[PDB]
Design a protein around this ligand. Structure first.
Ligand SMILES: NC(=O)c1ccc[n+]([C@@H]2O[C@H](COP(=O)([O-])OP(=O)(O)OC[C@H]3O[C@@H](n4cnc5c(N)ncnc54)[C@H](O)[C@@H]3O)[C@@H](O)[C@H]2O)c1
Ligand SMILES: NC(=O)c1ccc[n+]([C@@H]2O[C@H](COP(=O)([O-])OP(=O)(O)OC[C@H]3O[C@@H](n4cnc5c(N)ncnc54)[C@H](O)[C@@H]3O)[C@@H](O)[C@H]2O)c1
Ligand SMILES: NC(=O)c1ccc[n+]([C@@H]2O[C@H](COP(=O)([O-])OP(=O)(O)OC[C@H]3O[C@@H](n4cnc5c(N)ncnc54)[C@H](O)[C@@H]3O)[C@@H](O)[C@H]2O)c1
Ligand SMILES: NC(=O)c1ccc[n+]([C@@H]2O[C@H](COP(=O)([O-])OP(=O)(O)OC[C@H]3O[C@@H](n4cnc5c(N)ncnc54)[C@H](O)[C@@H]3O)[C@@H](O)[C@H]2O)c1
Lengths: 323, 323, 322, 323
């Protein structure tokens, strides 16, 4: 059916994501789990669940981590979808540049290892910062000669989940299933488009507050966790749902419209942007326009695009220094 | 309509179980989260999920843990179902006996706090060892004069998930949805009843191996996690499923048949046993007979019951020494 | 918990609607079936399905049909939602005016009988023409003093299913789950609002043809049945879907936004209109504005409203003359 | 990827069956509708429903009916599953043997026409009497040299629905999802095996009445319909559910255990029987034993098998005389 690989499976997001995929993957599928620590334990725990027709596979990377880990090279054979959720924490004395450099190098190494074996797979990038790790992944795919602009997806759906939760909390009992969220995936680059959902909106003063809340929502969860770090359970939810949209599209079981941080393929001045796309059997099938927006949303988007172009440049600069 | 409290919500089991309940609870429900550590973070993380009509509430207990925590007393008001997943799964320097006393203490304190506010709630006990913590819960409820034998459930379903997975792996493509598991919830007390499922079984030499594997399956996960972890994702799955049977039974939206470690209410010599029950609007509606078993299963059940009887006694003796 | 009565359960729409509700109603529900012909057969057939937790009740009306059948009086006790799918869709020698009088009288007798026993029930009117039968049901409720403007719903959702299918056929692979349809529920009164759905639209000349096909879609099925039949399976699908939104709303399992032909409660000059509402535990919880529309849609809506006004007036006249 | 054809789609079963298939078929499927009268009307009616990803096709046969209708020949191209729900009513003047001869000849002609174009399809026979029409379909497929014993299925699941409904009505609140029903599919040939379901059974007088009720349920509905004929809405339900098991099995999306009236392939003296099978990608994957039964069920099955053998011979004798 499909073979979905979670890369960083023993992680905060990767354990709960792996459980939701075990529950939701179509009968006949394989769930492949990789991590440099904890992967056997996760696979042994998930393998006890009574899901008939799901094969659980895993591989353990070396500690300390090696580039091009041969356990990952073997697990990556015959994978359709790679969900990259690997990451390392900022330790006391690590600068922001050090954190960026450490996680950028992990995304490069993992995409090189996986794509050298399964170059026609979809890559779903969760590892932050998405605005930068996506275009690092593209540069890495270009370097081996297998970049497919329709199969690289920056996972930005957690913004949509938040934007939806917050507007439904404000408009109860009027509910919507989703809110378009375009631009990028961090702070000022996040642009919720409430003007494109149905029904009367709260006053513009309230909308400024809600839109701001979407932009700083990650910091809201960092503060509430008081040292345990960023969102895990809501990112498992967003990641599992996004992965299941890809899977169903690859299997011919849906043609879903989603929001993701994607190669704009000449549709925009910005070469990567969170935008609406339809997914099909070959990955992205159609790039949709952003569509009509209010003057407030257009100003937010011009500001966002300026920062996204800097985020992308920072990714490509890192990728060309190392590759 | 229903308010479900997860007591121990920031734990390895608690966080994934809370995520599943957030996804699966009926529209109009409340999900109440309590922990002595990390409760605010978890609630903040889960509150960002776009599940319309689910209210997420939390309370943080004091550290160090205090008896009868007033933050719990407040959260416990209007709760229909308490899921007790708090506990200490392991601690270097502590034996099985030391951990029994620690987990017994936790269960007594939490059940007294919760039942003093919400005496008509259902109590689902996950905290190990279930064979002792369920009767400790019963002795606690009796001490405050509110014990309802139909509202106390020891959660033993993870044995059934394991028994189903291992027999489906053996018999594919012949699949069953469940396997009766009776007796108790640890090692020698687990008795899977493969004779009671449809279709031809493997040889008895193979069945002996499968039944043994169910009994020591927890140890298989501990070993895969290098002695430093235990089953968390498979217990979240079992816990969420069993909680949702209790929720739908309370709401009149199902009358499901489940296996749980319950008060036998005079239907067996052993006063608590993992047995088949039907759930309804008032908790347990019917206690079913174990049903026909082979001589091999009868021999395992006789051995198991002798152990469960000492496990119960040990739990009731702890409870009476401290109540 | 919920008791749903299908009134006209043995008809072409009533039999398939009853089947879908039997499959989809929440565990613990009752499905109550009534007809003047065939009800015992339909109830026996449905009662054999292995749906745990659903009770199937029926009653058989006398022939020839009487005002206020006592079988219906007894079945109507404890019913939360009445789905009125009774009627005469065609008869050789009868004009559209003749069919109006027949369907109008059937809706008056059935709404009086039901509401005399269960006045707090929601009333879902499927019987055509909806533009006239919905206000006739309102005048009948008023006549016994139990009219609740939040519990009467004219079922217009078939126009939405068609509008959605036709726009999804045109824009494949881009799929939307619904299209707003406002105004009324016949011919020129049906106003699809394609400007209110996501994603790029076909050119205005194409949207012209799709909007027109929605308006005459019912004739498309009548022609394909050689003049001897009409939409039954697609109405059963729409009927069952709309009923399930009312049921979940009443049980507090959803607060859905639906398009229905409803009493506008002073939110519009036109006293009944197909417009967006949110349903809750007491029926309509919120009446939403039509919202921003294109100059073409504004023009279609102005023509539609003029015709809906005449259709309402025609209904309220029938009800006051009888 | 699946193309399911309903042959008799404008009939009392075929209209409701086609609606349920339109709702339940996987996204990407095709629903093909054929009838000698009303098929354009049903197809126009179903084609207006807002189901994304389902293609609706139809063909209309000639009236009066002709053998090897060219419209069916074209519609049958690329079909994976043929659901045969055609039939003509007994009008006054017609004996019980005029009824049998006209329906048996319709089954023969339809199977000939469809299997000449799509010999590797599954054939699901709903047309009555199933005990005879199933073996007629088999003789027909043998004459053109394409009989696959694993791809011919007599649909007997309506007896399971009824056996399940009746025992659930009697045992409430104890629910089971299915009851084994073996033998054949009419009157005394129908043998519900209540000894093989979980939980305590009602007393023998209650069981006797329920077993009898399953046997005469077809007649209970004919009487209630008081001249409108046999079951339609509950046969649409059973037929849709059966078709959906066959569909998922062909697509690799399930390996369901079902009860159907099938070629026993040397597993029983009786050459066609309602028995348990597992379905997979090539139709019947495994034929299971009837399993252990009580002396009363063994007495009922022995009588049943005597009459099923005569019903088979009645079909074969008809087919060999016309083939
Ligand atoms: N896209 C989003 O919306 C979003 C939101 C939340 C967090 N995230 C990002 O997801 C990533 C993971 O977050 P987390 O909380 O789960 O972290 P975590 O530290 O809990 O988990 C990361 C996991 O990756 C593993 N890992 C490290 N290097 C690896 C390698 N070379 N190969 C394989 N596995 C390796 C670690 O062992 C660990 O199990 C971070 O970059 C985080 O910022 C993204
Ligand atoms: N089949 C089963 O029933 C089964 C299987 C696995 C584990 N368990 C049991 O589940 C329990 C939890 O396991 P885990 O892996 O999630 O452990 P964990 O340590 O990861 O989480 C337990 C949580 O309980 C909290 N807690 C401790 N004392 C508390 C108190 N007084 N009030 C509130 N919260 C308190 C802790 O802070 C922690 O967040 C253990 O007892 C374990 O043995 C049961
Ligand atoms: N979009 C819509 O709302 C829509 C679309 C299609 C059809 N309809 C309307 O639905 C109605 C039913 O259409 P149909 O094709 O099912 O017709 P039908 O003739 O097949 O069924 C109508 C049923 O109503 C019953 N009935 C008549 N008078 C009754 C009474 N006094 N009490 C109880 N039952 C009574 C009949 O016995 C029959 O079973 C018609 O008015 C049709 O115009 C509405
Ligand atoms: N297997 C079971 O459990 C079971 C139960 C109920 C009824 N049945 C059988 O199902 C069959 C259909 O019953 P029904 O109530 O829908 O009958 P129906 O008369 O209402 O419909 C039968 C349809 O078959 C069509 N038809 C006739 N000849 C045809 C041909 N050559 N090609 C294509 N279509 C043709 C007719 O035009 C009609 O639309 C009957 O044999 C009935 O006895 C089976």
């Amino acid at each position: 059916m499909v073979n979905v690989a979670v890369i960083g499976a023993a992680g905060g997001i990767g354990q709960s994501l792996s459980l939701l995929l075990l529950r939701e993957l179509p009968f006949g599928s394989t769930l492949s789990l990789y991590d440099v620590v904890g992967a056997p334990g996760v696979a042994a725990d998930l393998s006890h669940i009574d899901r008939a027709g799901i094969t659980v596979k895993h591989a353990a990377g070396k500690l300390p981590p090696v580039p091009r880990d041969p356990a990952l090279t073997e697990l990556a054979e015959g994978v359709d979808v790679f969900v990259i959720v690997a990451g390392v924490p900022r330790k006391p004395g690590m600068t922001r540049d050090d954190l960026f450099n450490v996680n950028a190098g992990i995304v490069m190494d993992l995409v090189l290892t996986c794509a050298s074996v399964s170059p026609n797979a979809c890559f779903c990038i969760v590892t932050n910062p998405v605005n930068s790790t996506t275009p690092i992944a593209a540069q890495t795919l270009r370097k081996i000669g297998v970049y497919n602009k329709n199969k690289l997806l920056g996972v930005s759906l957690l913004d949509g989940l938040r934007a939806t939760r917050f507007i439904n909390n404000a408009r109860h009992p009027l509910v919507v299933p989703y809110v378009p969220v375009v631009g990028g995936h961090s702070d000022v680059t996040i642009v919720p488009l409430y003007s494109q959902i149905p029904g009367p909106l709260p006053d513009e003063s309230t909308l400024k507050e809600i839109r701001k809340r979407v932009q700083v929502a990650g910091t809201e969860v960092v503060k509430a966790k008081a040292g345990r770090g960023s969102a895990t359970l809501s990112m498992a939810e967003a990641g599992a749902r996004f992965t299941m949209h890809v899977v169903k599209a690859l299997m011919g079981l849906d043609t879903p419209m989603v929001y993701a941080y994607v190669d704009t393929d000449g549709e925009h001045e910005c070469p990567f942007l969170a935008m609406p796309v339809v997914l099909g059997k070959n990955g992205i099938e159609r790039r949709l326009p952003i569509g009509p927006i209010t003057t407030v949303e257009k100003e937010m988007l011009e500001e966002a695009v300026g920062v996204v172009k800097k985020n992308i440049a920072k990714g490509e600069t890192f990728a060309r220094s190392k590759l």
